[PDB]
Each structure stands twice: as C-alpha cells, then as structure tokens.
C-alpha cells in the first residue's frame, strides 16, 4: 500500500509522445479544443479527435460544453505543474 | 516544429516503470543510494545498480562521492516537481 505511487504509473507512461503532450503545454496556459488544436499545431482534426479523448481518459484533459462547441483543458493544475516542469528539464538557458 | 519537444520525450524515456519513480518520490523528500533503498523500499542491489545509474544516465538522477561512497539525489528541482505533481493528481484528499 502506497496511494500516490500505484495510481501515477497510470500517468507517467500515458505522456509518451511529444504530440499528445505539446498540446497541454498550450492547454496549460491557454485552451483550445480539437479544432483549434489541429490549426495551433498542425494536426488532423481526425487525429486530435482520438488523441484529446485518450487525454481526457488518463485525466490530464477535460472536456466541456460552451456555446456551440466542446472546449477542452486541463483537468487541474497538479499536472499542468508536472507538465511545466518536463519542460523546464529539457531547455536549461545556462549549463 | 519542435525546438524542445523531443528532447522532453527523451525525459518520458526515463518513466515507464514503477520503483524507478517510487525511489524518486522518496529522494523528493530525503536522498538515499543502492545499498540504503535497497533497504529503505525492500529492493535488491543487483537491481538498483541498474536503475540508479540508469535514472543517472537519464538525468532524472546525479550521484556525489563520499570517499569509498556515493550519496544519490534527483537532477534537479524541476524533475523533483514531475514526480511530486504526479503524486498529487493520484488522489485528491481533504486538508
Ligand atoms: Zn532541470
Ligand atoms: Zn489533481
């Protein structure tokens, strides 16, 4: 027995793929939805379509009505922190 | 367009498994090596003379000698912010 542990094994295989994770990036400061994604990143609407619903079902994203589309975001700021962080690692201005 | 992106797979390709990071969870509070996790996580010293230096040899970890020893940390304070955000969005609770 662990809590923490034996339930972000879940997440931290999940990110795996730049293409899934460089759209959080973005949600994580500002959101957009499938369709917006597709034309901020390049991808296919087809694409984004699977990729944003697996997101959604390992919970980094989430979902929403408004107006007359579905939004989607970060399900909170834990993991947008974590996400952050990944690539605060990754581009040091100074070794 | 990537700049950075595929070099923060390239820390994801370093996750993947589960004491590597149930180690680094415990650094993210107090810092332990091989023969002291080995007996801190009930882990075996064959194994973490693989999974140390891996981690080590994926930046997510850096050694410092003392003498005949080596101490073993995270890299630094933004993979330490990885892995405790993680075990913050593995449960929710009241505070
Ligand atoms: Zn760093
Ligand atoms: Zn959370």
């Known amino acids: 027995n662990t809590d ?3 339930r972000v094994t879940e997440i931290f295989k999940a990110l795996g793929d730049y293409n899934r994770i460089r759209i959080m990036e973005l949600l994580s400061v500002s959101e ?3 369709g917006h994604i597709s034309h901020q990143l390049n991808l296919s609407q ?3 379509s699977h ?3 697996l997101l959604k079902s390992v ?3 989430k979902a929403k009505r408004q107006g007359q589309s579905m939004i989607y975001s970060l399900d909170d700021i834990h993991v947008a922190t974590m996400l952050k962080q990944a690539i605060h690692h ?3 201005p100074k070794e």
Do not use: G
């Open 4 to 6: 923490t542990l034996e």
């Open 46 to 48: 087809s694409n984004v």
């Open 32 to 34: 957009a939805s499938v």
């Open 59 to 61: 919970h980094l994203v």
């Open 90 to 92: 990754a581009n040091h």
């Open 51 to 53: 990729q944003l619903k």
